[PDB]
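Morning!

As promised:
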Amino acid sequence: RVRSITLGNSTITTQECANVVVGYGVWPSYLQDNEATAEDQPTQPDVATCRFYTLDSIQWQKESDGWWWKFPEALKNMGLFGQNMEYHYLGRSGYTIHVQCNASKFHQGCLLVVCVPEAEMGCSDVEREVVAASLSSEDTAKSFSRTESNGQHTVQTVVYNAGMGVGVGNLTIFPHQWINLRTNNSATIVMPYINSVPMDNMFRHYNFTLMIIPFAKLEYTEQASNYVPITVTVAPMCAEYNGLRLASHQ
Amino acid sequence: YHSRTESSIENFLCRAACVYIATYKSAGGTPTERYASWRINTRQMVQLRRKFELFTYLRFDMEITFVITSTQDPGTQLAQDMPVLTHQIMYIPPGGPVPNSATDFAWQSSTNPSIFWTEGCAPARMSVPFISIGNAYSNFYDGWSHFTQEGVYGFNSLNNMGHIYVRHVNEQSLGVSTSTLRVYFKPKHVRAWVPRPPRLSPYVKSSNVNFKPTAVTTERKDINDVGTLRP
Amino acid sequence: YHSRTESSIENFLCRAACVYIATYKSAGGTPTERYASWRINTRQMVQLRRKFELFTYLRFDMEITFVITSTQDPGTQLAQDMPVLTHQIMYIPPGGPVPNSATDFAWQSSTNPSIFWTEGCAPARMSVPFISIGNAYSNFYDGWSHFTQEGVYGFNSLNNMGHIYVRHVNEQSLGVSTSTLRVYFKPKHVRAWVPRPPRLSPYVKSSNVNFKPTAVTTERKDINDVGTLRP
Amino acid sequence: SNQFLTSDDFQSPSAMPQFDVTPEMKIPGEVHNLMEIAEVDSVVPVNNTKENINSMEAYRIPVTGGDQLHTQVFGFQMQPGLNSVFKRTLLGEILNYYAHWSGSVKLTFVFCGSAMATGKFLLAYSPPGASPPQNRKQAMLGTHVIWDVGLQSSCVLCIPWISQTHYRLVQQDEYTSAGYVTCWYQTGLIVPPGAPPSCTILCFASACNDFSVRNLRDTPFIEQTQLLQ
Amino acid sequence: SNQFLTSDDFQSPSAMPQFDVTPEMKIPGEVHNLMEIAEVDSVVPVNNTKENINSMEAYRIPVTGGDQLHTQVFGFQMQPGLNSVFKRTLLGEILNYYAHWSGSVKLTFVFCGSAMATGKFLLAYSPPGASPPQNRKQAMLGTHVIWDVGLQSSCVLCIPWISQTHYRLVQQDEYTSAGYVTCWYQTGLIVPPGAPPSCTILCFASACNDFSVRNLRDTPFIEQTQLLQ
């Protein structure tokens, strides 16, 4: 009931037996023959890239609004998977995002953990455009805001419109999980590869966005540690590439 | 037990809609109002844009219909008896020769499919298949056009359907005839994937997803405020 | 595995192409602009000439279509109400009576097939079979027309397809009506032999293979000069 | 005839015959019916009180802790599509695209408190031709469930479909002909020393399997008319 | 309808029915597909350096003899139809008639020297998202063959088809997305007394069996527009 998961000869994650969300209903898989357009063979690096990339922990405070990571840029420096994003041209990968919190029984709160395919985001200034430096950092989260952002080339990071101009309660349409600290502790979503082409270049394109939004805010009394660490762990699935060359950049 | 055929994807996204009304004259002056032009995009009309933006990936054929009604312009030098007006509607396939002005070789290009239609009968119709290098069109594109994260944030994507150009075929010297084109676009055999939430904020421009922060719903008096209580 | 039907000989040489645009009036003056005339040859239009000159020997039927749009001429003595314009398009079979001018007995000759077409409906169409004493047409002829190496270098060959002559049938006294003919020629059931290299030099005239010496390709900086190297 | 009905299915000649379409590949998440988008739960803005609608406070139903024991938690008129509580959720955005609707609504209330908290709520439902309950004793004699939040964290409350006719108009307001779902304090909210006294409920509404719509039209939400630029 | 699509196959009434066509005879060399013209080798103008294009010197790749041992013989960007090296050969004249293309390119390098000459060349190929090699050591670690001209006179080098999508546009210039084929001196060119020291290579490009085109259009080469006379 405290079963350990070992993925590759480097990683150990301890986890109890809970519920998973599998994509839009499909497991990630390898490309078959009547699915691709490229003129070569994939040569998937199964022997080295399937492991757990535990990112840094964020602190769910009382006054926090939400965080998002864009993928696959979220593993740009994470080990050999970041090297394959350099020394290739096309790529195709599913992921198994596992999100878990360490709260006591005297904490309360609720999170919504969404995976949004093609989460294109609007800018904080109309009649203007975003830059790539405001969409995502390479490994750290990007914070939503309670109030209105007002920059020139930034993102409209207000929390109830989710950066996309929609209702934040309707993000339940995409693959999601609720971390309710009363009963739930963890959340694990298995995203497949969703695109309109069989393989895309994973520098320009953002395949999906992992959003973690607190709907019921965190409350605690005065004895308690005044944050709950949220730890995200991403494991790539069935990664395969094409176009061996040098790194650009660098 | 009722029927759910009214809310299938074919019955929800396949209705004809007037998406473009333009006008074009038939005599000289500036070389711009002698023809009409419409780049085929489902973003200029908000009503149809919101229905298409309930989905991430779409795949459909097109069924375009042209309602052309002409009139006689006022002023001096009127035509009295004028024979009949014939109109050329040209579909420039994506990456095809595009007319700078009327009477340009682009009009006589064999590559661009064209319809010659005479006034007084049933309207002109054409069907265009799914024309893309990709395997679907994408309503959203979280990415860039060029390589090193440079370019416009999702506008040079392979979601190009082409253009439609309309002009008078006649060589009319005396009198001007002003025609008005109505384009009734309709998708056929629609296949849609990855349902998205319906949009809350109003649109600002047909190249972006930019928005202003709007409320999630409409206000109420209290949390326990049912309304009216007629009895 | 893709499909190769787009580059078959039928799909490459069978597209309709506007090969001749002429105009012809309907009232007197000089007896030349009252009718139109086109000797059927695939050499006056360079774009179609280059596609046909990828082959030495061709064999096809013809599918000719005529797009006739008329107009009312300006000036005094205008027709006000004019009934309708009927046009005669005559195909003079090779070695057949050819009209010197309008209202000539050649027009009423039973031998030359003709189409009577009234304005306001679908365009006029005719199909001509493979008409040759030989067993194919020849795009090239390394030889002479007469016996003892005298004559023109390949112009009186049995590659004659005939002529097309168009006139107004009406007897219109008051007012002039100027019509413009567009010929959309198209080959059907094409069979082609002996593939030839595509031409490098530009053409000079539609009776020869004469040319000016042009470079084989476009220049470059060095032999080891790849271009740009963006990264 | 020789007319043009805009609502008329007819084949047309292809403008580009002789063109091979890109072979369709397996993309996950295919939609065949709009009702599959409506049968997912969406968070219901119950607290829409004019200073919460521009924040996240219009999703959280406040359950304060102390000495009330006879007052109300919330309450709304149960009609999706026209009520402000429901017209912007996924179910009520699809209902605004149609003129008729028919089926059940499934509500789910999740108690987002600490595991050490305990209390009881009375979740009453009133029928369409009936007045909203005014106290907890009137709501007890109606149709109620007792949601003991120490035992369960979610209370699924499905609402029956009662009407004289087959379908029902979406954009009309038949007052006192829809039903009310109110909630009353039964015990309070008992917490040990160290647990926070006040808490939060979230509501999730969706459709059921018997749901249907008819007579498609334009959504009332989009007012823009002229083309963009 | 009652329209005229120019791209519409329809039978028409024959102008001359009752006429017997000349019986077709067997002429050798029948063509059924345009791709059969592209699968023949044509001599590639690699030396197109603005004073060779008006001569035969823009077909001969010069391999001088002496002491270089680290320099380059040639190199080009591997894209037929748009590159000046390939757009006038038989393969690149057919590709300019179409807007899409897909398939492999087969190169063949023939050493036109004397039978007493001996040397070694390194024939490197770089992938589409990769930089051209700058010296012989960088080209060795890529994809290379060693062509020993004392043993073989021809070096057939077939080039793979790598793209993200199914077809590929001909008239567009995706820089650093096509591939480079360079050639480097490995040893030199060793000749006995009596043999000429400098020599000549010729290149021959064609298509392969997996080749296809789509979306026919007009060739960019012919600019004349008005009819001849």
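The first helix of chain E runs from residue 35 to 38.

Hope this helps with the figure draft.
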